[PDB]
Amino acid sequence: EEASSTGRNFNVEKINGEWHTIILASDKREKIEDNGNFRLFLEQIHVLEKSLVLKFHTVRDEECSELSMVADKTEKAGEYSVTYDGFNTFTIPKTDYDNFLMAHLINEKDGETFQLMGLYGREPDLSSDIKERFAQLCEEHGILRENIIDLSNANRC
């Protein structure tokens, strides 16, 4: 079964655990390119009562660096917020819990904004069919495929 974090049947505890950044997408490509602040490699999601603890690592000059963030539930069901290089809110428009998780995020910094979409997998890669479903979801948010970056052969340290 698949669900949306904003859906009536969403079970947040089922997204707990191991996750890997498979593909990142953005309408501001630089944010997820080699030195962008949003090229984050997810490692796990710890589901709490009113928040999610996200553990990521970044890379610079082939060197991994750990970083944790706490995303708090907001007044909108299925929506979380977190301060990081500006103010961010995100939802999970689609997840099947056991294979993939697709997140849609809005960042607001210095009076501006950009969208970030992420495809995370329980394993360090996902099937071409799931990757195609992600490209369709990105398209529905106005993000061109050329702004979608597959990081599957670059997510391990």
In the chain, domain spans: 1-157
How is the chain split among helix, strand and coil, in percent rounded to 5?
15, 45, 40
Quickly count: other Cβ atoms within 10 Å of residue 111's Cβ: 6
Please state how this structure was obtained.
X-ray
Q: What is the resolution of this structure in A?
A: 2.0
Query: Which residue shows structure tokens 């977190």?
Result: 82
DSSP state of 48: -
CATH architecture of 1-157: Beta Barrel (2.40)
**Euclidean distance between CA atoms 152 and 20, whole angstroms:** 8
